[PDB]
Design a protein around this ligand. Structure first.
Ligand SMILES: Nc1ncnc2c1ncn2[C@@H]1O[C@H](COP(=O)(O)OP(=O)(O)O)[C@@H](O)[C@H]1O
Ligand SMILES: Nc1ncnc2c1ncn2[C@@H]1O[C@H](COP(=O)(O)OP(=O)(O)O)[C@@H](O)[C@H]1O
Ligand SMILES: [Mg+2]
Ligand SMILES: [Zn+2]
Ligand SMILES: [Zn+2]
Lengths: 276, 280
């Protein structure tokens, strides 16, 4: 029937040279592994185990960031297999500094960086399990709910190295307390709740564990330090790579200042006698 | 004075402070860059303009076979798609990668002095798209009474860094791969409706393009076709008769008009006999 000129033109065009400019892909493809949970809806009673099947994710570099032991860059995830990472979402990728790798070079014969990453991610998951328990038991009078971002393990061939990746938060990033026990002076309810949380972890684990270095945006936290409060040696004191002083626990008990949240949580004074 | 954690809760936390087993399943697959021939109006393909993609996409293919099928100017090898950025290709799906015979290149080197292979691929994919556009008009305008719709597979351009070369890629069809008509202008005698429709399609293209184009070498599995030969019925230029590289027989259009036999479909489409006169 009707065989237009547009239709004809578009057909005939295919018979001739159409311009083609091969442009290498944008960004880099990377492999992602997840630390899975046997019971997500009940994270504190769930078992953590590493996934085996690495899924691909496509990331594009945007910018950057530096803290203590890591270098961080902000990226965009344009796509990923089975949505292991959310497409159209911003992420932060972290890698350990030279000194840090050089410090655990002895502790970890081969795949030092890989192990450092595994431990770092496992550390944040531990904190996560504690915030989860916290939100389950805290009184209804306590509004907010601390939460740690999930971190994923990442392998990049481009760079030929292992990294940790997590969602990028938007807003003013702030540190509520640190590895030496210093705390900000709570100017609002949320900050109080955060400060009370570190106290709560100690009491909740019968003085066995303490989470310091609470930092993030709002109630969303990341990069915590999970301290085995009874270890008498730094080398075996922290879950993942962290800058700790052996005075940490003692310092926290001395410096911490209980607030209306600590009281709402019915938490005992950290200065009390441990055998009383 | 409190409500501390349980054993299960404590075990799950403390276990994270220790080395947990991580056995990364070994990496299989070949990294490749996929390029697509895009369309301005994919919804109205026959009224759409074709343009090559600029920015390449990432994908991974498993070369599970060394079996190179075919006897023509090209050879086909099955590969597996582990993953493809944006799922342009389907993961955990079999594809066919096609390349030409060095001889063929050597032949066209005297026409495509530079990046001969890539150029041939660009042409092959453009040729199949031309076939697709005609099939789109065909299925869109054909009478409702006709139950079948010819379909050409989509072909993508693929670059392999490891193999250091360009290939054309398309889904791998499973089933009896057959030919309805060929480059000589010869056709089979239809046994069923599907075949009658395939054969009528070739006739239809000649008619639809007012005698400018003829699609021959209809072949594939069932309705799904691939590797057709879009012939510029009037051209005389050495290698300018077919949109893509193909060996045409001694005056294929002549043979086709002479040997083709119209069927119930040709009549359903109201097509006129090819043996008639061009001018009278
Ligand atoms: N998840 C995040 N979202 C937004 N910004 C972040 C995030 N994590 C870290 N940052 C920013 O990048 C800086 C470095 O953080 P990081 O790489 O974790 O270093 P560190 O080795 O100190 O833990 C921080 O000071 C912070 O401003
Ligand atoms: N899309 C496909 N699906 C399944 N098999 C295919 C496909 N394309 C090609 N083949 C197989 O591989 C062979 C190569 O065909 P083709 O690319 O057309 O090369 P040739 O130039 O020799 O005709 C075919 O004969 C067929 O058996
Ligand atoms: Mg063939
Ligand atoms: Zn307190
Ligand atoms: Zn006919």
């Amino acid at each position: 029937y009707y065989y237009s000129a547009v239709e004809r033109n578009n057909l005939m065009r295919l018979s001739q040279s159409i311009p083609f400019v091969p442009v290498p892909p944008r960004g880099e493809p990377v492999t992602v592994y997840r630390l899975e949970e046997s019971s997500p809806s009940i994270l504190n009673n769930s078992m953590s185990s590493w996934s085996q099947l690495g899924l691909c994710a496509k990331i594009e570099f945007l910018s950057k960031m530096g803290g203590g032991l890591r270098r961080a860059v902000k990226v965009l995830c344009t796509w990923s297999e089975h949505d292991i990472l959310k497409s159209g979402h911003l992420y932060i990728i972290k890698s350990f500094l030279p000194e840090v790798i050089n410090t655990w070079s002895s502790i970890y014969k081969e795949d030092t960086v890989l192990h450092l990453c595994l431990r770092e991610i496992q550390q944040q998951r531990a904190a996560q399990k504690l915030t989860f328990a916290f939100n389950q038991m805290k009184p209804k009078s306590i509004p907010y709910s601390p939460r740690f971002l999930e971190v994923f393990l990442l392998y990049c061939h481009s760079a030929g190295q292992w990294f940790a990746v997590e969602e990028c938060m938007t807003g003013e990033f702030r540190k509520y307390n640190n590895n030496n026990g210093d705390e900000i002076i709570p100017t609002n309810t949320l900050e109080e709740i955060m400060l009370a949380f570190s106290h709560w972890t100690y009491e909740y684990t019968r003085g066995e564990l303490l989470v310091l270095d609470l930092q993030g945006v709002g109630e969303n936290l990341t990069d915590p330090s999970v301290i085995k409060a009874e270890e008498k040696r730094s080398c075996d004191m922290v879950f993942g790579p962290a800058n700790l002083g052996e005075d940490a626990i003692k310092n926290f008990r001395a410096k911490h200042h209980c607030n209306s949240c600590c009281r709402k949580l019915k938490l005992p004074d950290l200065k009390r006698n441990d055998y009383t």
